[PDB]
């Protein structure tokens with residue numbers, strides 16, 4: 001699927017290595033993010049919330065994209081598809097930017113370990 005494919009292209013990792021990382025990557029989220037990669041996911045959730053408030057269904061939207069030397073190019077028939085691509089693009093770029101502190105120990109992080117307050121969007 002789309003976001004997964006973008007994650008793989010931009011990070012060199014498998015999609016599943018971001019699908020359940022930390023306290024925010026993967027469905028829902030609560031408490032304080034564990035690291036910068038997790039912050040990308042906190043922000044991505046916020047981005048999807050903004051799209052939902054605009055009338056989009058970002059968990060369901062399918063979009064088009066290409067990756068060249070110039071970056072990620074988003075596309076789609078509808079504005080909601082293009083918005084979803086923009087949210088994903090920002091998160092995939094955030095993942096790449098933070099590859100230096102990605103830690104395998106936060107993949108499949110048990111949710112009971114998430115503590116502290118929940119940052120606002």
Ligand SMILES: [Ca+2]
Pocket residue numbers: 023024025026027028029041045
């Ligand atoms: Ca999440």
Ligand SMILES: [Cl-]
Pocket residue numbers: 033034035036039
């Ligand atoms: Cl951090």
Ligand SMILES: [Cl-]
Pocket residue numbers: 043044046047087090
């Ligand atoms: Cl965002």
Ligand SMILES: [Cl-]
Pocket residue numbers: 065066067
């Ligand atoms: Cl491509």
Ligand SMILES: [Cl-]
Pocket residue numbers: 070071072073
């Ligand atoms: Cl880009």
Ligand SMILES: [Cl-]
Pocket residue numbers: 102103104105
């Ligand atoms: Cl590691």
Ligand SMILES: [Cl-]
Pocket residue numbers: 013104
């Ligand atoms: Cl790794």
Ligand code: NA
Pocket residue numbers: 079
């Ligand atoms: Na429109």
